[PDB]
Amino acid sequence: LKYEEIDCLINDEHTIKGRREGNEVFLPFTWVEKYFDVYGKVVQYDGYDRFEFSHSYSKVYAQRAPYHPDGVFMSFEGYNVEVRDRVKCISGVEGVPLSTQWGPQGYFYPIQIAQYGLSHYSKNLTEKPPHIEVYETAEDRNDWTVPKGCFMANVADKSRFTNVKQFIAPETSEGVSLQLGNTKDFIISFDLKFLTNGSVSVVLETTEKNQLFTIHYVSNAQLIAFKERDIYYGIGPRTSWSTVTRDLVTDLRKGVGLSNTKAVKPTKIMPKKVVRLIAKGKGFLDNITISTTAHMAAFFAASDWLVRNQDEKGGWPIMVTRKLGEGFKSLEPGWYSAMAQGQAISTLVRAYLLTKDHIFLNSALRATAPYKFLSEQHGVKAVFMNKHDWYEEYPTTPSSFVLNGFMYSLIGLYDLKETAGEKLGKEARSLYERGMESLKAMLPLYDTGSGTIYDLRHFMLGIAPNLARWDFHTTHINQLQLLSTIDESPVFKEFVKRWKSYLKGSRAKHN
């Protein structure tokens, strides 16, 4: 009811307007929010309005079980790699993300590709099975339009023990068209083999004023184009049988948001109906499908990409310049990352456990080699103060000692040593053991008393600490709580507990 406006002098240098009722002073949240860097808003419920304050914005993952290498990967069941605006698109040829974080030109970032695979792996274990509608098997168990000038038939293919739909259509015609009409699901899948150049295109009804947009999957290696209401993805020659799987929601959003910058422009556009599929050129088509999700095809696109792109040193070279900050020498394209090696390993190990295909395990085993060589010999190892081995997310000179990347490097070694067995696992066992000793000793250097630091650049360069933003702080917690389920050391449990309290505004005691 009754109050009194009062001047509030802040640190003797700015005045704000507060309110007073007797002895109690009330300060405007507008100030509190900005001055303390906190969060809150009024939430309206039925018959009750309530202001709701948060020290931080991120959340910690509620672990349902101890970590195991064949299970979900940490909290990645909730990751969403493809909406990240630093993902320019999902490659047509490779079926994996292309990053633009550190250059508008685009590049395959092995970390991003592995996360793509591990998140989809994790959602395969946690989400409900998808609806799968089948539109075309060409067998004896929703028809096609064939304009004059074109042709279609059911033909056997002994190489792949099924019937198959042949199509011939000039690239100057309407093409041959199959009516789909799906309202609910947006993952399109089909087996394809071209004899000549061509395209397979999908018409979408969209939420932007009921307009049709068309996505063309063209038989070239061009990445992505967008003109008016046509989006084009190059999917390569596809002259041998392959299953093409695309997420039309993502393919539409990335097209419409195409940008010459490092970030996709935001869009609200969604597809509301998969109208039809249009084939041009000469070729063959089978098992045409629309599904709610296709997690496994994504996981194997990442896994296959990692196998095929590993170098003979066992590394995934990162083909972009990385400038970590004033004081660190710039990393020329080709550098390795312990986070990439670890995340790749976690991916390949899971591919191996699913398939028993030893090419996956062989790729994983090779991937430990860079952990053995120092950064200046094109490895990822750094040594803290001539005493503790570390595996560098960014193998900088001087060394950088990024915490979260290191922990990811260790979870990979863990995945591998538990999967390869006693003899084959030896090197990974040894790198893990040395790493975990380093981690336990060095954790306290990342603890500010009300947060965490991202890296040790303050010490390595003589500068301000690089405080970890809250989404890295919760990553730190997520990583440590996972390690606490496969290593019984008290230190991990104590730090997890303290670092969680920091999310709620707890502080270490001052003297």
Ligand X SMILES: O=C(O)[C@@H]1O[C@@H](O[C@H]2[C@H](O)[C@@H](NS(=O)(=O)O)[C@@H](O[C@H]3[C@H](O)[C@@H](O)[C@H](O[C@H]4[C@H](O)[C@@H](NS(=O)(=O)O)[C@@H](O[C@H]5[C@H](O)[C@@H](O)[C@H](O[C@H]6[C@H](O)[C@@H](NS(=O)(=O)O)[C@@H](O[C@H]7[C@H](O)[C@@H](O)[C@H](O)O[C@H]7C(=O)O)O[C@@H]6CO)O[C@H]5C(=O)O)O[C@@H]4CO)O[C@H]3C(=O)O)O[C@@H]2CO)[C@H](O)[C@@H](O)[C@@H]1O
Ligand Y SMILES: O=C(O)[C@@H]1O[C@@H](O[C@H]2[C@H](O)[C@@H](NS(=O)(=O)O)[C@@H](O[C@H]3[C@H](O)[C@@H](O)[C@H](O[C@H]4[C@H](O)[C@@H](NS(=O)(=O)O)[C@@H](O[C@H]5[C@H](O)[C@@H](O)[C@H](O[C@H]6[C@H](O)[C@@H](NS(=O)(=O)O)[C@@H](O[C@H]7[C@H](O)[C@@H](O)[C@H](O[C@H]8[C@H](O)[C@@H](NS(=O)(=O)O)[C@@H](O)O[C@@H]8CO)O[C@H]7C(=O)O)O[C@@H]6CO)O[C@H]5C(=O)O)O[C@@H]4CO)O[C@H]3C(=O)O)O[C@@H]2CO)[C@H](O)[C@@H](O)[C@@H]1O
Ligand Z SMILES: *[C@@H]1O[C@H](CO)[C@@H](O[C@@H]2O[C@H](CO)[C@@H](O[C@@H]3O[C@H](CO)[C@@H](O)[C@H](O[C@H]4O[C@H](CO)[C@@H](O)[C@H](O)[C@@H]4O)[C@@H]3O)[C@H](O)[C@H]2NC(C)=O)[C@H](O)[C@H]1NC(C)=O
Ligand U SMILES: *[C@@H]1O[C@H](CO)[C@@H](O[C@@H]2O[C@H](CO)[C@@H](O[C@@H]3O[C@H](CO[C@H]4O[C@H](CO)[C@@H](O)[C@H](O)[C@@H]4O)[C@@H](O)[C@H](O[C@H]4O[C@H](CO)[C@@H](O)[C@H](O)[C@@H]4O[C@@H]4O[C@H](CO)[C@@H](O)[C@H](O)[C@H]4NC(C)=O)[C@@H]3O)[C@H](O)[C@H]2NC(C)=O)[C@H](O)[C@H]1NC(C)=O
Ligand V SMILES: *[C@@H]1O[C@H](CO)[C@@H](O)[C@H](O)[C@H]1NC(C)=O
Ligand W SMILES: *[C@@H]1O[C@H](CO)[C@@H](O[C@@H]2O[C@H](CO)[C@@H](O[C@@H]3O[C@H](CO)[C@@H](O)[C@H](O)[C@@H]3O)[C@H](O)[C@H]2NC(C)=O)[C@H](O)[C@H]1NC(C)=O
Binding site for ligand Y (CB under 6 A): 58, 61, 75, 78-81, 83-84, 86, 99, 101, 109, 111-112, 115, 324-325, 339, 402, 404-405, 454, 466, 471, 475, 511
Tokens 């000039």: give the residue.
170
Q: Using CB under 5 A, pick the residue from 63, 137, 259, 430 that binds Ca ion.
A: 137
Name 203's bridge partners. Answer: 214, 276
Residue 241 makes contact with ligand Z by CB under 6 A = yes
User: Residue 440 touches which of ligand U, a second copy, ligand W, none (CB < 5 to 8 A by kind)?
Assistant: a second copy
With b meaning 16 or more CB within 10 Å and e meaning fewer, what string describes 367-391?
A: bbbbbebebeeebbbbebeeebbbb
Residue 285 makes contact with Ca ion by CB under 5 A = no
Residue 287 makes contact with ligand U by CB under 6 A = yes
- Closest distance of CB 115 from a second copy, Å: 18
User: How far is it, in rounded angstroms, from Cα 319 to Cα 296?
Assistant: 27
DSSP labels, 245-312: EEEHHHHHHHHHT--SSSSPPP----EEEEEEEEEEEEEEEEEEEEES--HHHHHHHHHHHHHHH--T
- Closest distance of CB 196 from ligand V, Å: 5
Phi and psi based region of residue 314 (left: phi greater than 0; alpha: psi -120 to 50; beta: remaining): left
Judged by CB under 6 A, the chain residues 257 through 296 that form the site for ligand Z are: 286-287
Q: Which residues bind ligand X (CB under 6 A)?
A: 58, 61, 75, 78-80, 83-84, 86, 99, 101, 109, 111-112, 115, 324-325, 339, 393, 402, 404-405, 454, 466, 471, 475, 511
Stretch that binds ligand W, among 160-168, 336-344, 423-431, 464-472 (CB under 6 A): 160-168
Stretch that binds ligand U, among 123-131, 172-180, 461-469, 502-510 (CB under 6 A): 123-131
Judged by CB under 6 A, the chain residues 184 through 243 that form the site for ligand W are: 191, 241
DSSP labels, 329-395: PPB-TTB--HHHHHHHHHHHHHHHHHH--HHHHHHHHHTTGGGGSBGGGTS-EEEETTTEEEE-SS-
Kindly determine how many residues on this chain lie close enough to bind ligand Z according to the rule CB under 6 A.
8
The residue among 163 and 206 lying less far from Ca ion, judged by its C-beta, is: 163
The residue among 113 and 164 lying less far from ligand V, judged by its C-beta, is: 164
Residue 239 makes contact with ligand V by CB under 6 A = yes
Residue 82 makes contact with ligand Z by CB under 6 A = no
User: Tokens for 126?
Assistant: 């946690």
Nearest-CA neighbor of 311 among 340, 332, 331? Answer: 340
User: Tokens for 365?
Assistant: 């085993």
Residue 138 makes contact with Ca ion by CB under 5 A = yes
The answer to whether 234 and 220 have CB atoms below 8 angstroms apart is yes
Tokens 């053991």: give the residue.
433
Judged by CB under 6 A, the chain residues 173 through 212 that form the site for ligand Z are: 191
Residue 161 makes contact with ligand W by CB under 6 A = yes
Residue 216 makes contact with ligand U by CB under 6 A = no
Stretch that binds ligand W, among 64-72, 155-163, 222-230, 459-467 (CB under 6 A): 155-163
- Closest distance of CB 286 from ligand Z, Å: 4
First to last CA, the chain: 42
Stretch that binds ligand V, among 68-76, 190-198, 345-353, 477-485 (CB under 6 A): 190-198
The residue among 87 and 164 lying less far from Ca ion, judged by its C-beta, is: 164
In this structure, is the dihedral angle defined by the CA atoms of residues 18, 20, 24 and 29, taken in order, positive or negative?
Answer: negative
- Contact track, a second copy, 422-441, x by CB under 8 A: ------------------xx
User: Tokens for 330?
Assistant: 């710039």
The residue among 107 and 241 lying less far from ligand Z, judged by its C-beta, is: 241
Name 41's bridge partners. Answer: 52
The residue among 281 and 317 lying less far from ligand Y, judged by its C-beta, is: 317
User: How far is it, in rounded angstroms, from Cα 267 to Cα 259?
Assistant: 12
- 19's enclosing H/E stretch is strand 14-21
Residue 161 makes contact with ligand Z by CB under 6 A = yes
Q: What is the DSSP letter of 110?
A: H
Q: Using CB under 6 A, pick the residue from 237, 327, 398, 465 that binds ligand V.
A: 237
Residue 450 makes contact with a second copy by CB under 8 A = yes
Query: What's the burial of 272, exposed, middle or buried (CB within 10 Å: 0-12/13-18/19+)?
Result: middle
Residues that bind ligand V (CB under 6 A): 194, 196-197, 219, 237, 239
Residues that bind Ca ion (CB under 5 A): 137-138, 162-163, 286
